[PDB]
């Protein structure tokens, strides 16, 4: 920018999207990366491998195509994450993928966070990933119990119209249950 001697960060560093120091420690394992990403309304989960001209995504799952299986709830929460993880996990399995390492990108390794949820799901899908059990949420919060109880302090529906009033962590079970056998795209 200033002169010939000026040093311009790599593109994905200018964009503040890729942490290249971490990316290297990640590629070290030589295993596929379980890319855990989020959005205000959604949650993505991809299984990426290394390629000649850039990464290759062998299997993915997005909190939006979750409804395609009966999801009738919001898509930016814990239960959502887990499932999206399990969904990608399964597709992954179908692709012949057996193991991967958790890439949480620029997110924080906070306990019970959604990325770890995505990871719990992916693992339950049958994918082998180095993890640490007690950094994950306690199953119930994964179900979405923390939200149901939060609506108990109702007075006004936590969900604007949406579905239900007292919400349903059961809807979570029904879905996980569904993904664990047969169905298309899995």
């Amino acid at each position: 920018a200033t002169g010939p001697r000026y040093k311009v960060p790599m593109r994905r560093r200018r964009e503040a999207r890729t942490d290249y120091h971490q990316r290297l420690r990640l590629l070290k394992s030589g295993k596929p990366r379980l890319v855990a990403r989020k959005s205000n309304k959604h949650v993505r989960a991809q299984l990426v491998t290394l390629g000649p001209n850039g990464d290759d995504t062998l299997a993915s799952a997005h909190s939006s195509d979750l409804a395609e299986y009966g999801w009738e709830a919001p898509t930016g929460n814990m239960p959502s994450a887990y499932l999206t993880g399990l969904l990608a996990g399964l597709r992954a399995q179908e692709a012949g993928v057996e193991e991967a390492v958790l890439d949480i990108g620029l997110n924080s390794p906070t306990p019970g966070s959604k990325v770890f949820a995505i990871q719990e799901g992916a693992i339950d899908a049958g994918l082998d990933i180095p993890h640490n059990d007690d950094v994950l949420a306690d199953w119930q919060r994964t179900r979405g119990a923390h939200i149901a109880e939060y609506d108990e302090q109702l007075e006004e529906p936590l969900y604007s119209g949406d579905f239900d009033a007292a919400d349903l962590p059961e809807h979570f079970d029904e879905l996980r249950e569904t993904l664990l056998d047969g169905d298309i795209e899995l």
Partner: peptide
Amino acid sequence: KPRDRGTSPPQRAV
């Protein structure tokens, strides 16, 4: 050279 300064891309290190 000044422009190649700074951390190198991980692609070739792997």
